[PDB]
Design a protein around this ligand. Sequence first.
Ligand SMILES: [Zn+2]
Lengths: 105, 59, 111, 174, 182, 282, 125, 75
Amino acid sequence: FDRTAKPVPVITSEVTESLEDMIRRRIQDSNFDDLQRRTLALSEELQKAHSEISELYANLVYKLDVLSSVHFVPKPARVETPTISMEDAQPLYMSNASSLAPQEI
Amino acid sequence: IKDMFSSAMEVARFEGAQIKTVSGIRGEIKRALSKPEGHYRAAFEDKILMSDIVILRSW
Amino acid sequence: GPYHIKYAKNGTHLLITGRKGHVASMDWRKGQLRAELFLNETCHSATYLQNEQYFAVAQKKYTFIYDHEGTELHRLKQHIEARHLDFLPYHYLLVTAGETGWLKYHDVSTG
Amino acid sequence: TRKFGLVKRTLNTKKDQRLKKNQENTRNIPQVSSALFFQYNQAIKPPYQVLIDTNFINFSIQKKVDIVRGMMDCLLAKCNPLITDCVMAELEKLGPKYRIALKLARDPRIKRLSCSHKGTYADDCLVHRVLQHKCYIVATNDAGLKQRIRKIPGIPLMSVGGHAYVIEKLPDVF
Amino acid sequence: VRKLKHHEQKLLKKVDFLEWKQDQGHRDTQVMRTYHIQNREDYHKYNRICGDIRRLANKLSLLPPTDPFRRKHEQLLLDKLYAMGVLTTKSKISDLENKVTVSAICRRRLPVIMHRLKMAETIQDAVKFIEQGHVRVGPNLINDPAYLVTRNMEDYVTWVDNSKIKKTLLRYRNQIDDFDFS
Amino acid sequence: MLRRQARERREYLYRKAQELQDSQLQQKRQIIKQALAQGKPLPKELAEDESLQKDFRYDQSLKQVDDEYAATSGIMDPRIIVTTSRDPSTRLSQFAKEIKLLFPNAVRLNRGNYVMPNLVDACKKSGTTDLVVLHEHRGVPTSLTISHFPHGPTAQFSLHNVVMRHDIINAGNQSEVNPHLIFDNFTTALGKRVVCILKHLFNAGPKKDSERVITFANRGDFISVRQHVYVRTREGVEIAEVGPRFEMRLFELRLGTLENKDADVEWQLRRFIRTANKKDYL
Amino acid sequence: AVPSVQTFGKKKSATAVAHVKAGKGLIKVNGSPITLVEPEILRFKVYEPLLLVGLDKFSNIDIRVRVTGGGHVSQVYAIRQAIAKGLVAYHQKYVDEQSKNELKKAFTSYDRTLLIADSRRPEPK
Amino acid sequence: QNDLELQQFLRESHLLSAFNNIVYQDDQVIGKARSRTLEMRLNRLSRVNGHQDKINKLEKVPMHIRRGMIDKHVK
Ligand SMILES: [Zn+2]
């Protein structure tokens, strides 16, 4: 009589040995199907084309942000120095120490 | 399924066999029921009817 | 207000235009209102075309052409910031001048 | 109070009748001829009437077959050759290279037949005559007109083949 | 204008008072009628934005194909427009010229979003429900019909509480809880 | 979140709908790329298709994990919840603990009276990536279901030849190190799909000296699962069986979570086809 | 049209619906008086919305509660939740906000599950 | 003659001369030169198996405009 499906294969000594020899060979070859971690000079005419496209892209993404953005959309835009120079122009100051750390000096 | 066999040993020799219905529905003998003796469990591709007849082809 | 007024060449129709967008075309002697528009916009001048059937309004930026009932037919993108409108009735030419310092003649029959 | 969703009235190009495209906006099943059997035209009998096409005359002259004599030899019966106004106009439009064909068409044994249609298109004129009345035999060598006449049932077709005229779809000619 | 006679039409072939070539088929009026746009200049502002997109796409195309700059910027533009909802797919670069339309932006306006969300039966009904103070996008009430909805912002377009519409739908399902204010 | 997941499911199904026409246009573009490279004539339809040739000037700059796994492949490690059927026996609880220890980021959760729609919602809001449900027949594990979240594939496997560490190992504890995976003899697209599903249950990038090896080997549509420990002797690598051994058989793969029965079937086992014996699908 | 209020209470598969309208003091559950709510051992759980605020708050209203689903315990908790929420909603709709706030304070001080539904959803670890 | 890039460079030498005011390589060529050279290559590939009517079809121009352009070009 005809059987409808192949029976479930039994695990025997030769099957186990073949499996273990495959595992041994792949360990020796270091072949491992592992999941790998995903991370994280042009010319002058090409540079001019890139600069023009960068400016156009900046303006376009500004206008699209104005359309879809929940808040107000701003327009798209360390040497040794005293911090009192880094402040804004007004009679007072609040911080005195120079910008560079001792480890940076 | 009943009346195909007379005992669970007879069923257990024929387990895994193709069977079919006079309608044409194909199925498989799966296991022998404990009680009563000749009965067995079968799985088909569709629901079958109590008017159906199950046949197993041998030579 | 204030209202800039224009009369048809027959004189049978009157076209008033407020600065705040109230533009009306009427048969002033009959007392029959042909059209009335509330554009909610700055309007400077209006003129009739060859009939009372068509009129042009110089709105905030662009000049618009409306029919007798008041539906917008045309928005003339080429005429920008016109303050003065005119029509030459034998040449079918609508003439616009304004803030840009450009005089533009548009054929109202062909477009 | 003001209504909600107020919009400015503009020109509806879909539904305004003043525009040209919007401004543009019984059953007849003809009877089958009583002259016909299922494919056999039984009313037709001698003397036959033969509507001639221009290229029939040209091939007649090239093969040196007389028109009336050749038709009588083909049919073994008397015939009336008919040239329509559009056929004669096509022969006249053919130019000065075909004045022999023009004169042999002017031959008085060929009877003229008036046309009341605009233009000069012998194919549609002859096909309309055929589709109206089943009394005609179409003489032509044009492939397209041959196919049209073959599609129309009950219409004999004459052609210039080899040494003499050949008839088709007329059961009487033996 | 009455219908021109035959000899008049030949001398007056170009005459047309209702359709001019500068009208461009009244495409703007057609789009505003489809999506119930109230402001007259909305189509032309949208058209200028579409023109910026198409100009940038043309320049990126004139860049050489195996350019990392070109590929990066085309993917940036496709992702940004898809996130806004203007582009339905991110598969093709050519959609940046073929599938950027004014109607694509107008389908992201709030009444069209509500009509697609089955909140209103027509876009005009949605417009009126917006101006009548029934609609909030998050905690914030929006009575501007021109407000554009992002794909992320679709999930918070809901009826305001204490809305007669909301009470009506809850009362229809017999699920109105007056403790929740409905 | 109820409105977000439905919308994202709709967008995912729309992408699956448009994928066929996108592929067809991809082969139409691939003829043009070969024709331009080799100077070969175009076919008549591509020659007379002016729109495709006009769009090729844009689409010339278009160039792999599956769609459900693309966003986070190697970025964020999985979170797996291992649970059982409704009233598990002690031996099923032991096997569930074994499977939890097999996976490196997996927690074993008591089923209790938990409804499957409530459990799936809990998993979604808690941010777990995968749910593994284990079934048994009187102490013998018979079925293993893996469902990916939020709307990922659901694969169902029939377990055979199950041997447990509680039986074979008298003593010793499992290493619980990020292991090295070996996927053997998966050739067809179904095999690649199963490899993707099983591979993304494990953390990305095990370090080179890792002594744990987990092996999934395809023999005649049956996947043998082994866990071994190796020591690199100068003579060779000796191997110690350290984990459970079982054979698993994919019989159903659906494009939805475990709660959804209306999910589209990517693949189903067909037992009663006439030529079912001849083919090997994995 | 009398002033009336509809509110819901839930506990597992049980669901209670309370209609609180202007009336004389009829408090009925499933067409039967509130004093026949079974079990005896859990009747005061049903009683306690009444007893926390006083029967004078119920002197001028009619409460009608229809309960389906669940078991005895779940149904008792659904009843008491629906009655408390219906009191708060009626005193906010047709009586003063000060009365509503005082009722909400009393109910919250005793048991918040009278007002807000207790949902025991799973927490994966 | 079997070689490709030489014959392509010879065929497109006029376009590169016109628009590069060498950058003949495909990974360097930008702008109008890239657009018109791609159009030339695609048209050449489509010519042999495409019906000529559907392959080359002119941009629609009014009669007097096109006749004047042809006359000036022929001059
Ligand atoms: Zn005729």
